Each structure stands twice: as C-alpha cells, then as structure tokens.
C-alpha cells in the first residue's frame, strides 16, 4: 500500500505513535516519507546482508526474522514479511520498541539526516487528525 501523507498521519495516530517517546506525529510521517516514500512494501538490502522492511525500513540485523541474516536477532518477535502489510500495526509496534532502545529516532539514519531539527509539523499540515 502507498499511503498519502495525512492518511498515514491518521493511521499512525490510530496506532498510538503520536508523541510516542516524545516524538510528534510529523517526526514519524517525515521518517516514513524518507525511509519508504510511504510504501508499506518497500524492501532494501544493506551492504552487510541484512534487509530493511516496510514503511519505517526496520532492519533484520536486530528487529525481525527473514531467515537470511546470519547472527541477527528478532527483538520484535515477528517475521520481517509482517512489516510489509497494508495494516501498519506490526511496523508501529516494532518502531515503538526501536525508539525506546536508547537513541530515540536516531536509529533511523534518514530521520537524523533529513527530518531531525526541521519543521516536521509541515508533514501533518492541513490533516484532519
Ligand atoms: Cl508527501
Ligand atoms: Cl508534528
Ligand atoms: Cl536470519
Ligand atoms: Cl532475538
Ligand atoms: Cl519468522
Ligand atoms: Cl493501518
Ligand atoms: Cl529521545
Ligand atoms: Na533477524
């Protein structure tokens, strides 16, 4: 599924991400824009053989099981395929564990490089939330 901007903001609020760990909804929408372009089915292979999955590009090195990332963990206790669903529940639940892990949203390098410090409220501007 490819979300629209306000459609995703709404879905993220419905699943409890707005102001989770103090990160406003525009932070989460901005991270999703630059990680996946709002596409739930996005996959990207990393140099090290891990893969990033879904709207928030969650990495198989730590968070999900894809059966092909040697020496990796599955701390969200989910198959990485669950992170590709039209329903963002699995991605949100897992993202809550990642953002609680100690470095906040810096875990998302695209959020650090493209969203952190910017006017992230623009991402929810005009949305009926
Ligand atoms: Cl957009
Ligand atoms: Cl915001
Ligand atoms: Cl594996
Ligand atoms: Cl594990
Ligand atoms: Cl699995
Ligand atoms: Cl959803
Ligand atoms: Cl923080
Ligand atoms: Na893994």
Residue 14: give its domain's CATH number.
Answer: 1.10.530.10
Measure 25 CA to ligand 6 centroid, in angstroms: 15
Inside any domain, residue 129: no
For 14, the token pair is 């419905």
In a domain? residue 27:
yes
Residue 23 lies in a domain: yes
Do the annotations mark residue 48 as ligand-binding? no
Label residues 5-21 b or e (16+ Cβ within 10 Å = b): bbebbbbbbebebbebe
Q: Does 101 reside within a domain?
A: yes
Instruction: Kindly provide the resolution of this structure in angstroms, with one decimal.
Output: 1.5
Residue 35 known to be catalytic: yes
Experimental method reported for this structure: X-ray
Q: Is residue 105 part of a domain?
A: yes
Residue 18 lies in a domain: yes
User: From ligand 6's centre to the CA of 49, what distance in Å?
Assistant: 29
Q: What is the total count of domains within the chain? A: 1
Domain of residue 9, residue span: 5-124
Question: Is residue 114 assigned to a domain?
Answer: yes
- The active-site residue, picked from 18, 52, 66, 87, is 52
């Amino acid at each position: 599924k490819v979300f629209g901007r306000c459609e995703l903001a709404a879905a993220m609020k419905r699943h409890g991400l707005d102001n989770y760990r103090g990160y406003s909804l525009g932070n989460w929408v901005c991270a999703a824009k630059f990680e996946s372009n709002f596409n739930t089915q996005a996959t990207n292979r990393n140099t090290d053989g891990s893969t990033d999955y879904g709207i928030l590009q969650i990495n198989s090195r730590w968070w999900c099981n894809d059966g092909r990332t040697p020496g990796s963990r599955n701390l969200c206790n989910i198959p990485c395929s669950a992170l590709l669903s039209s329903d963002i529940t699995a991605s949100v639940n897992c993202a809550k564990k990642i953002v609680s892990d100690g470095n906040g949203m810096n875990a998302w390098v695209a959020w650090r490089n493209r969203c952190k410090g910017t006017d992230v409220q623009a991402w929810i501007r005009g949305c009926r939330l």
